[PDB]
Design a protein around this motif. Sequence first.
Motif, PDB file in Angstrom:
ATOM      1  N   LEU A   1      42.638  30.191  35.143  1.00 45.79           N
ATOM      2  CA  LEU A   1      43.065  31.651  36.053  1.00 45.79           C
ATOM      3  C   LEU A   1      43.104  31.148  37.230  1.00 45.79           C
ATOM      4  CD1 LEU A   1      41.503  32.769  33.231  1.00 45.79           C
ATOM      5  CD2 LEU A   1      40.897  34.501  34.831  1.00 45.79           C
ATOM      6  N   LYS A   2      44.394  31.600  38.091  1.00 51.56           N
ATOM      7  CA  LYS A   2      44.486  31.580  39.375  1.00 51.56           C
ATOM      8  C   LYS A   2      44.553  32.985  39.905  1.00 51.56           C
ATOM      9  CE  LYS A   2      49.653  31.037  39.230  1.00 51.56           C
ATOM     10  NZ  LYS A   2      50.517  30.138  39.670  1.00 51.56           N
ATOM     11  N   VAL A   3      44.389  32.977  41.181  1.00 47.64           N
ATOM     12  CA  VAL A   3      44.496  34.288  42.001  1.00 47.64           C
ATOM     13  C   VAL A   3      45.772  34.489  42.508  1.00 47.64           C
ATOM     14  CG1 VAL A   3      43.382  35.419  43.916  1.00 47.64           C
ATOM     15  CG2 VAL A   3      41.963  34.509  42.279  1.00 47.64           C
ATOM     16  N   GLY A   4      46.248  35.581  42.270  1.00 47.33           N
ATOM     17  CA  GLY A   4      47.757  35.675  42.775  1.00 47.33           C
ATOM     18  C   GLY A   4      47.948  37.212  42.419  1.00 47.33           C
ATOM     19  N   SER A   5      49.081  37.528  41.560  1.00 44.87           N
ATOM     20  CA  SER A   5      49.347  38.792  40.800  1.00 44.87           C
ATOM     21  C   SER A   5      48.218  39.164  39.773  1.00 44.87           C
ATOM     22  CB  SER A   5      50.927  38.847  40.136  1.00 44.87           C
ATOM     23  OG  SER A   5      50.677  37.968  39.200  1.00 44.87           O
ATOM     24  N   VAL A  62      45.587  36.014  38.030  1.00 41.44           N
ATOM     25  CA  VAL A  62      44.876  37.423  37.921  1.00 41.44           C
ATOM     26  C   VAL A  62      44.614  37.711  39.618  1.00 41.44           C
ATOM     27  CG1 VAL A  62      43.519  36.616  35.854  1.00 41.44           C
ATOM     28  CG2 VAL A  62      42.632  36.374  38.195  1.00 41.44           C
ATOM     29  N   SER A  63      44.435  39.114  39.847  1.00 38.39           N
ATOM     30  CA  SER A  63      44.506  39.323  41.111  1.00 38.39           C
ATOM     31  C   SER A  63      42.856  39.187  41.694  1.00 38.39           C
ATOM     32  CB  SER A  63      44.808  40.860  41.514  1.00 38.39           C
ATOM     33  OG  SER A  63      43.655  41.698  40.976  1.00 38.39           O
ATOM     34  N   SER A  64      42.795  39.109  43.277  1.00 45.28           N
ATOM     35  CA  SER A  64      41.675  39.023  43.635  1.00 45.28           C
ATOM     36  C   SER A  64      40.663  40.168  43.273  1.00 45.28           C
ATOM     37  CB  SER A  64      42.077  38.870  45.283  1.00 45.28           C
ATOM     38  OG  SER A  64      40.809  38.484  46.152  1.00 45.28           O
ATOM     39  N   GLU A  65      41.330  41.069  43.183  1.00 44.44           N
ATOM     40  CA  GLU A  65      40.296  42.262  42.959  1.00 44.44           C
ATOM     41  C   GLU A  65      39.876  42.276  41.602  1.00 44.44           C
ATOM     42  OE1 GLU A  65      43.385  42.696  44.312  1.00 44.44           O
ATOM     43  OE2 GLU A  65      43.403  43.538  46.157  1.00 44.44           O
TER      44      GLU A  65
END
Length: 258
Positions: free
Chosen positions: A145-149, A215-218
């Motif tokens: 998992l990377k943080v983006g959308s 996945v999002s930061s949130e």
Amino acid sequence: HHWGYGGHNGPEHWHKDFPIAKGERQSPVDIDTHTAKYDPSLKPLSVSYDQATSLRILNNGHAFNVEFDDSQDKAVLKGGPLDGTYRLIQFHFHWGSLDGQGSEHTVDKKKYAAELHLVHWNTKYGDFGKAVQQPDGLAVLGIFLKVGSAKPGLQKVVDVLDSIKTKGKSADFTNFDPRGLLPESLDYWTYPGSLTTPPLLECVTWIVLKEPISVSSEQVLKFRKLNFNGEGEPEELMVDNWRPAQPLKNRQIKASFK
Ligand SMILES: [Br-]
Ligand SMILES: [Br-]
Ligand SMILES: [Br-]
Ligand SMILES: [Br-]
Ligand SMILES: [Br-]
Ligand SMILES: [Br-]
Ligand SMILES: [Br-]
Ligand SMILES: [Br-]
Ligand SMILES: [Br-]
Ligand SMILES: [Zn+2]
């Protein structure tokens, strides 16, 4: 068991109670992409989750597990490097306190923000507890998992976490479709390894997808609101529940893609 990911019971201590921690086929590992060999004999992965039946989500004090009905061949993994059929039992994640760490496997030393593990057991051994005693007992599909959308298919997991904040809490979790957690490509690396939590059994064929999901930061921030502790105990945020890379030793990582 007293192991964890705290200041005094973390991965570097596990070998005292679980000496296999210093074994020959431990996981995770760094994936050196230059060194991994393309193996034209590797087959496409077959991920067959159309009939998957999620049942429950549990905070077990070291992660949260989304559990499946594994009393029949519903959600199964086959093909790829595998001989036979592996049934989905649970998935869970590992994640960091910050986006710059959290994955267990690394790719040319890159750490991702988190890593999803879909755990499957070989039906030829009849039950999970028998499978983990065999060198070909489990197949774990690992997804970075990377943080983006945002990942729309993750949100249902995210939103139930408030109800399982502390160790030992569970909640009903039916009708969740794990296909919504799969990147577009099924290109992968594979190698023989182990469970990454005690008892660290050397029973796993690892299948690590090359393409991360976003996945999002949130979304990840909500993972980091979970607690390792039980209800009412001093709060210890569930963060940094990853084992670092272990020595590759006499193993080859193979790539399914040129
Ligand atoms: Br370690
Ligand atoms: Br590559
Ligand atoms: Br090879
Ligand atoms: Br596991
Ligand atoms: Br694992
Ligand atoms: Br076990
Ligand atoms: Br990719
Ligand atoms: Br994605
Ligand atoms: Br929350
Ligand atoms: Zn895991």
